[PDB]
Design a protein around this ligand. Structure first.
Ligand SMILES: Nc1ncnc2c1ncn2[C@@H]1O[C@H](CSCC[C@H](N)C(=O)O)[C@@H](O)[C@H]1O
Ligand SMILES: Nc1ncnc2c1ncn2[C@@H]1O[C@H](CSCC[C@H](N)C(=O)O)[C@@H](O)[C@H]1O
Lengths: 216, 213
């Protein structure tokens, strides 16, 4: 219904595309508010440091717990659902999106480098609900693109926000009826709607077997 | 060297590409407004589905004209769709050595199937899903695919366990003492146990076990 989303990142301009995709009517009706915060506002030093070397050695850098702790202390409450994107997370799915779509307050903590010192999420989980999640079986450079995916999948399930209204879906067609020597399947122009439904069901079955045998 | 062209009716949503990777002289990225290839005064790129159903389908005519101009026989045409083959880390490795990616971004209920079918007669075509959830458009999927590919371009299993940095004690929470010990063998062993434990809990499928619920 009415949702606030706060995103914390060292690249706040990355999140401009979705602030723009929000219909004015939804904002004016008080249905949604998305705010983006530069993590460097909570740094301690003149060099605005957000990362440091990993304990135990190895390549890369780790984001600092003292900076992230201060940021989340200010932005979160006991009622916040804290979302931490990570390729080592639980899978984010359509079920997850439906569940989160009724939340009052999401906070998304975007990592870079090797990620965030684990004590940040572990400390937060002693006083709010925390969810570490992966958006797929690949490695991104940062959490910003993951935040864009999560925000879009969730907000399209909130009535009236983004301006929109198993087996895989089969192919779709529209005008013109013939194009570059390819005709639309004649069954779709037949006016036999029980037959059309059966044809679509079989197309779905075939596509699922070919592309996603795991779903069977 | 890689060229990536992205085609969309919302070119503005792709502004963040100025941050998708450091590689952006190793890789050039260009964004194109699909409506530039309409002749219409209304520039209508969609209509109701044959056979019925909710929503609208993007017409093949406009897509055909755009791809005719942008693609060659060497192009790998990428078409995001939740009904696609899965896009995975193996896919990103495969695409990292391509000369030319073109990403065709859908809106509404997607693109007339004849666009991909026609394209496949002159070039390689890949319909792919980035995960088991539904987006409103292909633009966010294009940003994900570009990020995953560009960090693998030349010139640039299990779940990773937790990471830590200074200070060694924070809010009464200590960094695991083994990580401070300087013993490489014990640290490597501890990190291995951590990775396997996290994988059993969060992604049992990766180790060949049933998925939860
Ligand atoms: N598949 C994915 N899903 C969600 N976030 C991802 C992601 N891949 C990368 N990220 C984001 O990008 C950041 C850097 S990648 C971090 C790599 C780390 N060694 C690890 O495996 O955990 C992550 O902290 C996360 O915010
Ligand atoms: N999981 C996902 N992976 C990749 N692209 C996706 C996606 N979810 C939505 N999209 C994009 O968003 C657009 C609208 S979703 C419409 C697709 C259609 N109803 C079907 O089921 O096949 C798609 O054309 C695709 O470009």
């Amino acid at each position: 219904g009415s949702m606030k989303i706060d995103v914390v990142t060292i690249f706040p301009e990355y999140l401009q595309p979705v602030r723009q995709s929000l219909p004015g009517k939804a904002i004016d009706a008080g249905l949604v508010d998305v705010a983006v915060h530069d993590l460097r506002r909570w740094t301690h030093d003149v060099h605005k440091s957000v990362d440091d070397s990993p304990y135990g050695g190895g390549p890369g850098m780790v984001m600092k717990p003292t900076v992230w702790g201060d940021a989340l202390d200010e932005i979160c409450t006991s009622e916040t659902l804290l979302v931490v994107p990570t390729p080592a997370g639980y899978p984010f799915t359509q079920e997850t999106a439906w569940q989160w779509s009724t939340e009052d307050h999401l906070v998304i903590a975007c990592g870079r480098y090797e990620g965030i010192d684990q004590r940040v999420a572990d400390d937060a989980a002693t006083r709010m609900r925390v969810r570490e999640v992966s958006i797929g079986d690949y490695v991104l450079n940062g959490g910003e693109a993951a935040a864009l995916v999560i925000i879009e999948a969730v907000l399209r399930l909130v009535p009236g926000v983004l301006g929109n209204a198993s087996l895989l879906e089969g192919p779709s067609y529209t005008r013109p009826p013939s194009w570059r020597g390819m005709d639309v399947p004649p069954v779709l122009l037949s006016g036999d709607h029980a037959k059309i439904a059966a044809w679509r069901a079989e197309q779905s079955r075939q596509r699922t077997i070919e592309r996603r045998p795991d779903l069977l």
